[PDB]
């Protein structure tokens, strides 16, 4: 018998909901219009770090996730500081739409 490749996700758009704690959301973000791309020539906003046992890890966020939208705010063409401000002022529940590649 020879092995068959198992099912395999190549790309994925997700909606995740982070519950903020006193220490914050447990993520770092990188990139943005006007600053140095996180990845190739893509100027979008990216998750650069996830705290191992933090709120975002619990909610399933992963390093490399591209941030598309936060509580109804679209991040297309957002500057780095604009995405930071949207996130610091997102409140208790931070629901985000992300793009995830393998």
């Amino acid at each position: 018998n020879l092995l068959i490749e198992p099912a395999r996700i190549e790309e994925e758009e997700l909606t995740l909901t982070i519950l903020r704690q006193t220490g914050g959301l447990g993520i770092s973000i990188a990139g943005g219009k006007g600053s140095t791309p996180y990845k190739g020539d893509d100027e979008g906003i990216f998750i650069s770090r996830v705290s191992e046992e933090g709120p975002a890890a619990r909610a399933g966020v992963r390093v490399g996730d591209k941030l598309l939208e936060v509580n109804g705010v679209a991040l297309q063409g957002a500057e780095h500081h604009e995405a930071v401000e949207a996130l610091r002022g997102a409140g208790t529940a931070v629901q985000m739409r992300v793009w995830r590649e393998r």
């Binding site: 600053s35 140095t36 650069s48």
Partner: peptide, 8 residues
């Protein structure tokens, strides 16, 4: 420069 990083 390196890309910017902000902790949240």
């Amino acid at each position: 420069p390196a890309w910017d990083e902000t902790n949240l």
